[PDB]
Design an enzyme around this catalytic site. Structure first.
Site, short mmCIF file in Angstrom:
data_model
loop_
_atom_site.label_atom_id
_atom_site.label_comp_id
_atom_site.label_asym_id
_atom_site.label_seq_id
_atom_site.Cartn_x
_atom_site.Cartn_y
_atom_site.Cartn_z
N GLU A 39 6.07 -3.61 30.61
CA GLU A 39 5.96 -2.38 31.41
C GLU A 39 6.93 -1.31 30.94
O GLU A 39 6.63 -0.11 31.08
CB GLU A 39 6.18 -2.71 32.90
CG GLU A 39 5.04 -3.46 33.50
CD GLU A 39 3.79 -2.64 33.76
OE1 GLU A 39 3.93 -1.40 33.89
OE2 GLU A 39 2.67 -3.20 33.77
N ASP A 93 6.89 10.51 36.40
CA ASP A 93 5.88 9.91 35.55
C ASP A 93 4.85 10.99 35.13
O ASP A 93 4.99 12.16 35.46
CB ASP A 93 5.25 8.69 36.20
CG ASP A 93 4.20 8.96 37.25
OD1 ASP A 93 3.67 7.95 37.79
OD2 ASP A 93 3.87 10.13 37.55
#
Ligand SMILES: [Mg+2]
Ligand SMILES: [Sm+3]
Ligand SMILES: [Sm+3]
Ligand SMILES: [Sm+3]
Lengths: 146, 146
Positions: A16, A25
């Protein structure tokens, strides 16, 4: 009930990516650790927040509860820990609904474990790239079979 | 009664390392999980034994009974769960006798909580390196103060 192992956590962090400094993000959501978007110690994630690797693990175990619950709910056959850890990694990525409808799950519940492992490799596309997740799937499949 | 939390178990497993396949420790003792040397499911730990992460955690919770008992018998002041979990990690490492004679204990029982936390940092030497456990002690101290 089963739970993710320490090795499972280490491998999932590798897949991840772990970011100990808060960031926004690609969608604009404040994130920290391994995909943690919820609160951290009672506050929203925000610019400038930093956490330790151990806090990141704590948050990841909190965020994995839906994954572990999904495996518990959906899978009716025995799993060894490597199989379990690999599935945690797959599901954390593709989501519970995708796993529930998957060939991985159907083959697992028939105890066709090699066929379930091979079915990891179907979950390879993201966006406009038909195989971008395939290296991850191969590593997860390897773990499953180890 | 107070007992180690799931966060406490995760953090201790990080510090100690988890092995889900039996191995021989550096002295030659068959070991599995997080320092488990007793039997598992009625059999002695031996080469070829494997366990799950759930088992490893349940074995550790049972193996910590001497630690929990040491805290109950020696500590005279209230502990929050973070303090408790940090103490379990320290004591599981240094042993009951060392903890009984420690500055950590003495300070705790005077209700000098910050000084007790700081005294974790004294337990830093192993073999020929005078500080090799200091990073672990700093992480435990941070947990205690959390
Ligand atoms: Mg007791
Ligand atoms: Sm159980
Ligand atoms: Sm839960
Ligand atoms: Sm490609």
């Amino acid at each position: 009930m089963m739970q993710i192992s320490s090795n499972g956590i280490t491998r999932l962090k590798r897949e991840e990516g772990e970011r100990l400094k808060a960031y926004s993000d690609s969608r604009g959501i404040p994130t920290i650790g391994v995909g943690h978007t919820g609160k951290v110690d009672g506050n929203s994630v925000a610019s400038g927040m930093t956490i330790t690797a151990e806090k990141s693990s704590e948050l990841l175990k909190e965020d994995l509860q839906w994954v572990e619950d999904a495996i518990s709910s959906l899978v009716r056959v025995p799993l060894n820990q490597n199989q379990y850890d690999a599935m945690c990694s797959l599901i954390f990525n593709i989501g519970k609904s995708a796993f529930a409808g998957s060939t991985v799950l159907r083959q697992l519940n028939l105890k066709n474990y090699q066929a379930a492992a091979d079915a990891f490799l179907l979950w390879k596309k993201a966006g406009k790239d038909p195989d971008i997740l395939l290296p991850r799937r191969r590593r997860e499949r390897a773990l499953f079979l180890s």
